[PDB]
Design a protein around this motif. Structure first.
Motif, PDB file in Angstrom:
ATOM      1  N   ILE A 112       0.601  -1.610   0.009  1.00 54.91           N
ATOM      2  CA  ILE A 112       0.176  -0.005   0.358  1.00 54.91           C
ATOM      3  C   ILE A 112       0.780   1.465  -0.240  1.00 54.91           C
ATOM      4  O   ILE A 112       2.090   0.961   0.684  1.00 54.91           O
ATOM      5  N   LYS A 113       0.356   1.814  -0.205  1.00 60.17           N
ATOM      6  CA  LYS A 113       1.177   3.699  -0.107  1.00 60.17           C
ATOM      7  C   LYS A 113       0.182   3.476   1.287  1.00 60.17           C
ATOM      8  O   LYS A 113      -0.372   3.328   1.996  1.00 60.17           O
ATOM      9  N   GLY A 114       0.889   5.265   1.496  1.00 56.30           N
ATOM     10  CA  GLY A 114       0.070   5.596   2.804  1.00 56.30           C
ATOM     11  C   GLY A 114      -1.772   6.424   2.595  1.00 56.30           C
ATOM     12  O   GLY A 114      -1.263   7.127   3.833  1.00 56.30           O
ATOM     13  N   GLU A 115      -1.724   5.780   1.868  1.00 62.99           N
ATOM     14  CA  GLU A 115      -3.368   6.014   1.849  1.00 62.99           C
ATOM     15  C   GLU A 115      -4.220   5.198   2.286  1.00 62.99           C
ATOM     16  O   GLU A 115      -3.487   4.330   3.273  1.00 62.99           O
TER      17      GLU A 115
ATOM     18  N   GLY B 133      -0.072  -9.933  10.009  1.00 60.11           N
ATOM     19  CA  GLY B 133      -0.462  -9.188   9.084  1.00 60.11           C
ATOM     20  C   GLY B 133       1.282  -8.375   8.745  1.00 60.11           C
ATOM     21  O   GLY B 133       1.526  -8.228  10.044  1.00 60.11           O
ATOM     22  N   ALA B 134       1.529  -8.010   7.806  1.00 61.37           N
ATOM     23  CA  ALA B 134       2.385  -7.455   7.727  1.00 61.37           C
ATOM     24  C   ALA B 134       2.455  -6.483   5.838  1.00 61.37           C
ATOM     25  O   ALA B 134       2.053  -7.048   5.631  1.00 61.37           O
ATOM     26  N   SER B 135       1.991  -5.316   6.963  1.00 63.05           N
ATOM     27  CA  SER B 135       1.935  -4.395   5.044  1.00 63.05           C
ATOM     28  C   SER B 135       3.048  -3.482   5.549  1.00 63.05           C
ATOM     29  O   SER B 135       4.225  -2.607   6.655  1.00 63.05           O
ATOM     30  N   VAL B 136       3.737  -3.824   3.944  1.00 63.07           N
ATOM     31  CA  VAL B 136       4.800  -2.686   3.808  1.00 63.07           C
ATOM     32  C   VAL B 136       4.459  -1.451   3.844  1.00 63.07           C
ATOM     33  O   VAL B 136       2.777  -1.532   2.791  1.00 63.07           O
ATOM     34  N   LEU B 137       4.189   0.564   3.267  1.00 62.82           N
ATOM     35  CA  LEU B 137       4.030   1.304   3.167  1.00 62.82           C
ATOM     36  C   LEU B 137       4.932   1.748   1.660  1.00 62.82           C
ATOM     37  O   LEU B 137       4.220   2.857   2.000  1.00 62.82           O
ATOM     38  N   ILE B 138       5.149   0.978   1.386  1.00 63.46           N
ATOM     39  CA  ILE B 138       5.778   1.861  -0.404  1.00 63.46           C
ATOM     40  C   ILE B 138       5.557   1.278  -1.295  1.00 63.46           C
ATOM     41  O   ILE B 138       4.961   1.581  -2.214  1.00 63.46           O
TER      42      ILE B 138
END
Lengths: 251, 292, 282
Positions: free
Chosen positions: A148-151, A246-251
């Motif tokens: 994801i992005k920071g949205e 759960g593991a979300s990169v944000l770039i």
């Protein structure tokens, strides 16, 4: 007694055990043939490995490698090839067989012919969040890695409970710093800081009612492997279930 | 029922210009180069009706006007509002909040100490700032002419220590920014650095120890900060303890030459002595550079 | 400071530390003082020159003793006119047994004495012909310094041009390796788990021994581990070494070695011998 071989097996989490065989020309055989070759003034040998293969079981099936392999030939070297076995939920240990063909070519086109074949068992020498009290399990139905992005974005919990009283639990993210060697002190502070304000839950203190859609927004960039802010509280017999999933990169 | 205040540090580059607060805060950041990032704080307050019909609930700040949400019957919907910090040196927050009457003696021997009175004045006057701009002007979706306002005075209860840190930076112990010359420097070059330090009005609290110690930590932008041997990393003259003093506009200017990589972030730490567990402030200005 | 020898190459020491604004350090082995120098290599290979340094210093005991003398008993010139100019060596012989507390002098205090003797010092001063115009000041200064603490301010104001700095030196010959190499590899990761976004390190380090080898370590990965098996192709340029790995795996231990110090060596091609092994996994 010309090339010592070993096999290493590892257990990947994606239900595919990976086993890699490694081959290396042994040093005792190296000096053994090397003094007799340097009598005839030879410094580098030529062991031509022309047919290397691995077989599966009592019916012989040839499981391939994970990449390509030509017919190579070198001296005083080592090479490893990795095959992907299938992960077994039972206690049946697979026993495989490997085979090679080293052409130990002495010079002026006067070659010997050697072949070898080992056979052994591919052992490995020895997530779904479940609570401690009751039948209640947790698993994120959507793929736990997400890019994801920071949205704004969404994420999906799922509860498998005892059907006697499925309700009476609440979720919240707890956006505050945990209250904590200056170097380890500040490293634990940076971990507790970027946990406590990295992502924020867009519906906390949230009563649940077998799905439960809960919606975040992510602020700060970085990979949040086992993002452990959010904490599902069980109302009756007041205890806390951590959700280390759960593991979300944000770039 | 509840409220929480969280700051932000990422710049929020564009194509994320659909979320209602982001265009306003990035418009204020975008021009007016003194109007910087890193000091914005979002306040997170949760509207919850107890009714049978939907509401619209537009929130107006002193210039920030939110979008049009939709709370249906009993749900919460966290409306996120930006606000800047409140400057401690520009204001005064150590005066007694007045009573309405001038008749009663009001038990004039007030049962309070000095510092408990001052933190009570801070806790009252911070919510006195954040209530006196906040509004909301709601309407029902199925009736459309029952438009009323709300207050906030009977809803916000009090603050804690986290809100008075996050809203008010005067509660902290020092005020620091950083000045860096080139954030895109090639590896064979040494670059002067600057750390400005400006103490607080809570400098009265200790009054005896006239020195405090500014530690320096370095972290790879990912995680897992570098131990001070700093091989493959920033080659640094001096040492990272650098004593500073109370009531001083000091500037611990240092030097930094890289070795291998790009992604470096620099920050400070205040520790009040040289021993273990003397630490007071985990300061977090945390600016970044790159080395090609 | 640092000095360059008479051979006089284009050694560009950009690092040169001058503690002009601080007259301060501490070396009590709790924190770590690191000085570093950004030198340059020569116009060609140059492996054995001699470097000599220049550390001015003092010791903190006579720093605080200079502070105590110049601002505890001889602050003004009125007492320095008569009361201490006739007993300066006696003042030094009294000051040499002061033994101030240098264990709490690095934690929120400076010029603070320890629990040393102050009883018979008055009798020792009374035994000689020390007049009361100096025996009042020399007792009141020791009584004040028995319990007092200063700060980091007004320390350089006493230290300024009142200390003989022992400008010591050393010898650093800028040591060198023996076997030059120059290699560059390239990788192509056959993904087990999709990508773990690894962080890279293009090393440059040479092995200097006989019948030896060059051992390399893979890049560092920081997401979900135990996976991302990287295939590789060598192109071992500018030499003929021996390789000992093929199509490794970027988990816990791979150690893609390269036996180097067997055949086809060279000389010292630079300041030291080098092996600038630059992997490029694209």
């Amino acid at each position: 007694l010309l090339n010592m071989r070993l096999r290493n097996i590892s257990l990947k989490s994606e239900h595919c055990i990976l086993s890699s065989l490694d081959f290396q020309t042994s040093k005792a055989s190296e000096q053994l043939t090397k003094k007799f070759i340097y009598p005839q003034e030879h410094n580098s040998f030529l062991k031509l490995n022309f047919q290397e293969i691995s077989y599966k079981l009592i019916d012989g099936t040839s499981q391939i490698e994970l990449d390509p392999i030509c017919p190579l030939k070198v001296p005083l070297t080592a090479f490893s090839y990795d095959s992907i076995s299938a992960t077994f939920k039972l206690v049946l240990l697979p026993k495989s067989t490997q085979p090679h063909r080293v052409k130990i070519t002495l010079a002026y086109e006067l070659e010997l012919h050697p072949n070898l074949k080992l056979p052994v068992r591919t052992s490995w020498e020895t997530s779904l969040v479940n609570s401690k009290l009751s039948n209640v399990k947790f698993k994120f139905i959507n793929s736990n890695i997400k890019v994801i992005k920071g949205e704004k974005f969404t994420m999906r919990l799922q509860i498998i409970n005892s059907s006697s009283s499925p309700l009476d639990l609440v979720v919240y993210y707890n956006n505050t710093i945990n209250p904590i060697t200056l170097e380890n002190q500040y490293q634990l502070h940076n971990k507790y800081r970027k946990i406590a304000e990295g992502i924020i839950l867009l519906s906390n203190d949230y009563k649940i009612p077998y799905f439960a859609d809960l919606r975040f927004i992510g602020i700060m960039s970085g990979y949040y492997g086992t993002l452990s802010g959010l904490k599902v509280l069980d109302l009756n017999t007041n205890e806390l279930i951590e959700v280390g999933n759960g593991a979300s990169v944000l770039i | 029922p509840s409220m929480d205040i969280i700051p932000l540090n990422e710049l929020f580059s564009s194509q994320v210009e659909n979320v209602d607060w982001i265009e306003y805060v990035m418009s204020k950041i975008r021009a007016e180069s003194n109007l910087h990032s890193r000091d914005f704080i979002l306040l997170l307050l949760d509207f919850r009706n107890s009714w049978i019909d939907g509401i619209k609930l537009n929130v107006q700040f002193e210039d920030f006007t939110s979008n049009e949400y939709h709370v249906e019957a009993s749900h919460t919907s966290r409306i996120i509002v930006p606000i800047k910090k409140i400057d401690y040196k520009k204001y005064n927050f150590e005066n007694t909040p007045i009573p309405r009457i001038y008749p009663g003696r009001q038990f004039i021997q007030s049962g309070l100490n000095e510092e408990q009175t001052i933190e009570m004045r801070q806790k009252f006057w911070c919510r006195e700032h954040i209530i006196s701009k906040l509004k909301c002007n709601w309407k029902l979706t199925t009736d459309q002419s029952v438009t009323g306002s709300v207050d906030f005075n009977k809803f916000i209860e009090k603050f804690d220590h986290k809100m008075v840190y996050t809203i008010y930076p005067g509660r902290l112990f020092y005020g620091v920014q950083l000045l860096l010359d080139e954030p895109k420097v090639k590896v064979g070059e040494i670059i002067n650095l600057k750390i400005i330090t400006e103490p607080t009005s809570t400098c009265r609290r200790k009054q005896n120890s006239t020195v405090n110690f500014l530690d320096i930590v370095i972290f790879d932008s990912k995680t897992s900060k570098i131990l001070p041997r700093s091989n493959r990393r920033i080659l640094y003259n001096g040492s990272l303890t650098k004593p500073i003093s109370t009531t001083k506009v000091s500037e611990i200017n240092l030097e930094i030459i890289p070795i291998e990589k790009g992604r470096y972030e620099f920050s400070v730490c205040i520790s009040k002595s040289n021993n273990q567990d003397g630490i007071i402030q985990f300061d977090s200005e945390n600016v970044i550079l790159s080395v090609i | 400071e640092l000095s360059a020898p008479d051979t006089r190459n284009d050694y560009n020491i950009r690092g040169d530390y001058i503690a002009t604004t601080p007259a301060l350090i501490t070396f009590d082995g709790n924190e770590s003082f690191i000085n570093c120098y950004e030198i340059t290599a020569n116009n060609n290979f140059d492996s054995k020159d001699i470097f000599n340094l220049k550390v001015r210093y003092n010791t903190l005991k006579e720093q605080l003793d200079c502070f105590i003398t110049d601002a505890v008993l001889i602050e003004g010139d009125v007492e320095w006119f008569i009361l201490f100019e006739k007993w300066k060596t006696f003042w030094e012989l009294e000051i040499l047994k002061k033994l101030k507390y240098d264990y709490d002098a690095f934690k929120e205090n400076r010029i603070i004495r320890l629990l040393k003797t102050s009883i018979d010092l008055n009798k020792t001063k009374s035994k000689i012909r020390n007049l009361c115009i100096e025996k009042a000041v020399l007792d009141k200064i020791l009584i004040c310094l028995n319990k007092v603490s200063r700060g980091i301010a007004v320390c350089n104001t006493d230290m300024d041009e009142y200390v003989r700095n022992l400008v010591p030196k050393q010898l650093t010959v800028p040591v060198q390796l023996p076997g030059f190499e120059q290699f560059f590899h390239v990788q192509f990761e056959q993904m087990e788990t999709s990508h773990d976004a690894l962080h890279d390190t293009i090393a440059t380090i040479g092995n200097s021994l006989s019948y030896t080898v060059i051992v390399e370590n893979l890049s560092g990965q920081w997401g979900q581990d135990v996976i991302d098996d990287g295939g590789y192709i060598f192109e071992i340029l500018s030499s003929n070494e021996w390789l000992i790995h093929g199509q490794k795996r970027c988990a816990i231990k791979e150690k893609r070695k390269e036996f180097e110090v067997h055949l086809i060596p060279l000389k010292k091609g630079y300041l030291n011998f080098p092996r600038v092994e630059i992997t490029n996994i694209n």
